[PDB]
Symmetry: C4
Subunit: 228 residues, 4 copies
């Protein structure tokens, strides 16, 4: 209609989204203050009301957006994110997990999707990921196989670190980040299993060498984009 076009030109208004962005940074500050228990004694009700004010506004104005765009809205990854972020924010407290209330803070990520400069940089990062998928596949296979080996080789006498497949996953990722791999994992390990370095020195080497290539690769593919 021209009703649909009236709503649409309010919805795609620059001011409309600048008001939204403004609502985001305001509520962002809000949530910064609600970590403080001092501030929460004084203005607990103030901030808890503002939070509801803004979330209804977001639901009001995602209703409007869906009107304007219908199917195309749900095929847009930025819009989808604002949907599922305001969704998890909608569910009320004391229903399901209580952890859902920390997830309310995800609303702030609307800033990324509402700002164009932020949307540009995110798309640039996400762009890189497809080229990485082979290396990620390889590395996951490598982690999985060594997790099993380490679980089997060390999980009985070292149950906190290797007693479980998932425990070995975590410990192995720790090692890969190089965080206390020697004086916190392998040197203790070796106190019982003196040849444990035979398992972990190669693990280090391979994991490192692969990550280097992961990065080198990303660089090359960015230069191949400039050279066209």
């Amino acid at each position: 209609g021209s009703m649909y076009l009236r709503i649409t030109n309010i919805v795609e208004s620059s001011f409309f989204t600048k008001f939204i962005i403004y609502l985001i940074v305001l509520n962002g500050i809000t949530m910064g203050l609600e970590t403080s228990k001092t501030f929460m004694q004084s203005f607990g009700v103030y901030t808890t009301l503002f939070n509801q004010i803004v979330i209804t506004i977001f639901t009001i104005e995602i209703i409007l957006r869906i009107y304007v765009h219908r199917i195309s809205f749900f095929k847009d990854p930025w819009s989808l994110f604002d949907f599922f972020v305001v969704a998890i924010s909608l569910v009320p407290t004391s229903s399901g997990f209580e952890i859902l209330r920390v997830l309310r803070v995800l609303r702030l990520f609307r800033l990324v999707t509402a700002v164009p400069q932020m949307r540009k940089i995110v798309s640039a990062l996400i762009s890189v990921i497809p080229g990485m998928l082979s290396v990620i596949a390889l590395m996951t296979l490598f982690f999985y196989i060594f997790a099993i080996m380490a679980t089997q080789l060390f999980g009985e006498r070292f149950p906190e670190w290797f007693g479980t497949l998932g425990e070995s996953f975590y410990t192995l990722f720790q090692v890969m980040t190089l965080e206390s791999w020697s004086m916190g994992i392998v040197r203790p390990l070796m106190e019982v299993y003196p040849y444990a370095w035979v398992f972990f020195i190669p693990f280090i080497f391979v994991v490192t060498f692969v990550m280097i290539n992961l990065v080198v690769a990303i660089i090359v593919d960015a230069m191949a984009i400039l050279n066209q």
Copy 2:
């Protein structure tokens, strides 16, 4: 013959290797569950049978592959790997080391050699290695010489870390990864040998500087490949 060509067109069948790949991921999951002792009480016999089912299949079908290809098979590094991986998997339990049973998990790496996308990424990594061989030679020489020096300079009062050439190798590699080099090695060292930094600050610097070049080099040689 045309028998040889009949076997060969079953062996090079797409479906044939898709069945193999499928057998790999199945058994991969299997081995994930056999880390669990719960699952092993219930279905111990089930998984231990599946494992034998699949390994015979792999030996059956490496026999077929060798038939089809004979000498050319044993000059292919992917095929060779499947040979020596199914080989170490063949030897029965309680013969030789018992560690051979964790090595059975290496079978999962067949995924890398059976999948073409995985084979591509591995070849890409292995490609990089030849250019690195000079730097690796240098660094090994450097490690060896400092290992000796550190063994001699510190192995008596610090026998757990430097008492042996191999111990100093391990400790020096630890340092290179920067893992607790100061508050776990050098600062304790210095409690007795106050000028120990004179040995380790340069060691750090050289090792770091070389590794940077190792990487920078890899990058350049990848760009020299794009620029042709």
Copy 3:
């Protein structure tokens, strides 16, 4: 006038700034010795006088520079820095914070602004920063949102690390540097909150992946400068 031009050709003299540079390295050494309490017992008065000698000289000769250049001086970032560095150096001891006396050492950074080769390398580094501003914005938003989440999720039972928004900021930056993230933060955390890895493994991953891109980006933009 030609008075103004007489002062100006003394002020822009090569020798003039070589004398200044010389005054900087001398006083640099001075301040190296005044860390020593031995040296301060013997020559305390000597160095404390030299320091005043030189600072008056610097104020004398920033007066001259402002004469020669007036407004253009205050629109130059190198000159501005020498202004505010000699300014904070001017304020006398025991007025305001006492920390202002360590800030006197900032005078040595005049070397960067007085030497041309040093000025070149600093401008090269500062040049890089504008391209980084999107990624920095993103990362700050990401840090802020996870700081809040971590403050809320863990600040009661872990008040030293997550009890405050700013405490969580510091702890999260620690994690990003990978410094004791597992055996000093997450593994203790998990002793009470077993699913804490669900918060921190992703945090690691995202922070790392972004930093890689931060760097990769810098590289590309430097090559885009060579290719013109």
Copy 4:
């Protein structure tokens, strides 16, 4: 003469240096065994004799080399290194420091100078250094200025880490490597000086950011070499 040319064509003989290289790896192994006290009880005299055999040979054959080349020898950095390495190896035990005997192991680095492939890779690394000299100057100035500040700000209550200019240098380098910067330096520091992060978070940032550029720079200058 043609005597000089007779000696010269023995000295520049391929076999001559292959014999030398062979002497190096032999003695390299020797010195590996002399770390072992077992081996030193049995063959102490054997290895200690071999060591003298080879060093005289090296002095014999650096005499020959100097004959062949005279001044040009002493303007070659590879030859110079073999001079000063065999020199420090010449001085006998129990004269001066005893540390001179560990320096005997430096002889093994003759491998780098005697092998051409090794000489190539070393020259490639050393090549990189000139471009780095500005950044190194800057960073040294930065380290020095913060060392002083940290010595003054923290050396009284933290004398093991900051009580001395050189102590602060070491601690600051530790921080730069990120080794236990938080749970081993700054968090303890903060127990007394709660605003200590104001000094160290910026220090981290600047040091990191500079090192990135140090590396990025090296990459660019290597590509500028390929693009000619």
